[PDB]
Amino acid sequence: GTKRPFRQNLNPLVLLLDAALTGELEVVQQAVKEMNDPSQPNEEGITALHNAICGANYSIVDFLITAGANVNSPDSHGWTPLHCAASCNDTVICMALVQHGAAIFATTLSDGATAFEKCDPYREGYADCATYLADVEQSMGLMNSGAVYALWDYSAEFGDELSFREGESVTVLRRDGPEETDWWWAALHGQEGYVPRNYFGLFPRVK
């Protein structure tokens, strides 16, 4: 025990990530106060919220979302918190993410899969989680008078596309245009144009 010298400047992120994973709510709470950024990723693109979800620590998921953890943060492989939650058929976490601004149509980096597609047919809760995510997919651009919330800036690359800012309420006019499966015809400040599905949530972010 003698030999190892003590560290004077421990990294709150390393403590946060470990706590989020093992299930140490109080450690996570103190670590969040300490640093600016709870949503800060490690090398792999893994956040407190990722670890909390894979650890199945519902109390820490809830605390991290409320404190304004990035519900859309992709890891190295383009897996969002919603992808991870779906892969465990975790309907309760899927609901909490969607309700705090998760992008239902977000696609992974390699092979371009949605959260719905990551549901595990050989584990409890498959039907419940698949049903929920498919219902959110259906509901998007239909609920809230077609209003959906931009989760990033976008710059039109053709004249029939709509530019928009992070946070802006965009109104979907037509979804199922057979001409585009990944794009909606939408309205913002009396402009009309195609917007990409995967940029939007059913609810806004927390600040």
Numbering used by the authors: 616 to 822
What does the report in the manuscript say about this coordinate set?
Since the KD for the interaction is with ~90 µM relatively weak, we fused the p63 peptide (amino acids 332‐342) directly to the iASPP CTD (amino acids 625‐828). In the crystal structure, the p63 peptide of one fusion protein bound to the SH3 domain of a neighboring protein of the asymmetric unit. The p63 peptides of all four chains present within the asymmetric unit of the crystal lattice adopted an almost identical conformation with differences only in the orientation of T335, Q341 and F339. No electron density was observed for G332 and D333 at all, whereas G334 was only resolved in one chain. In detail, the p63 peptide adopted the conformation of a class II SH3 domain binding motif (PxφPx + ) despite the lack of one proline. P338 occupied the second xP pocket, whereas R340 contacted D775 and E776 of the RT loop and E795 of the n‐src loop which make up the acidic region of the SH3 domain. p63 R337, at the position of the aliphatic residue in the canonical class II motif, interacted with the RT loop as well by reaching towards E776 of the acidic region. The proximity of the W767 side chain could also allow for a cation‐π interaction via the ε‐amino group of K336. The ankyrin repeats (ANK1 to ANK4, dark grey) do not contribute to the interaction.
Here we characterize the interaction of iASPP with p63 and show that it binds to the linker region between the DNA binding domain and the oligomerization domain. This stretch contains a degenerate class II SH3 domain binding motif that is responsible for interaction with iASPP, as well as two positively charged amino acids.
